[PDB]
Design brief:
This protein has one domain (about 1-165): Growth Hormone, Chain: A (Up-down Bundle). Helix content is about 65%, strand content about 0%. It contains 6 helices and no strands. The protein is globular and about 45 Å long. One of its GO terms (molecular function) is cytokine activity.
Length: about 170
């Protein structure tokens, strides 16, 4: 078992939270899977994973994929701020997914041997992105929380298979 093995075991907890953070805000969200479809074609602005990154069999890299995970978790952190207080009923569950998602940001920058820290998105610019998720109508607002849990589910998933394939 190495610090990397703990990095994966920690992301698995991140998704366990998203379950309690995407079950209520998906069925009773009329914008995820109410009972018809819920065209979620908004696509927030937090993309960062594909076949070019190297997080899949096609050119499965190692330092390029894990890198996208460090900066991918920092941006994910501002979106966690979204679900860090928006959850007033299950606020505890929202803190269970954010606290862990932070445990990976520090556990990586520290155990990122043979890496680069992957820098991080300035908080001043991330202040405008967050002001933008909240500057959307009530409709686009409930959708922002949806797509966020959509990346955490998939995005984090590939992060685990990338740390195990490394």
């Amino acid at each position: 078992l190495t610090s990397s093995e703990r990095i994966d075991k920690q992301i698995r907890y991140i998704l366990d939270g998203i379950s309690a953070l995407r079950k209520e805000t998906c069925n009773k969200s009329n914008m995820c899977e109410s009972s018809k479809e819920a065209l979620a074609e908004n696509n927030l602005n937090l993309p960062k994973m594909a076949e070019k990154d190297g997080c899949f069999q096609s050119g499965f890299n190692e330092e390029t994929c894990l890198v996208k995970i460090i900066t991918g978790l920092l941006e994910f952190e501002v979106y966690l701020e979204y679900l860090q207080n928006r959850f007033e009923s299950s606020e505890e569950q929202a803190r269970a997914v954010q606290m862990s998602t932070k445990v990976l940001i520090q556990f990586l920058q520290k155990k990122a041997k043979n890496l680069d820290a992957i820098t991080t998105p300035d908080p001043t610019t991330n202040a405008s992105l967050l002001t933008k998720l909240q500057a959307q109508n009530q409709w686009l607002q409930d959708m922002t929380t949806h797509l966020i849990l959509r990346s955490f589910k998939e995005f984090l998933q590939s992060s685990l298979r990338a740390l195990r394939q490394m």
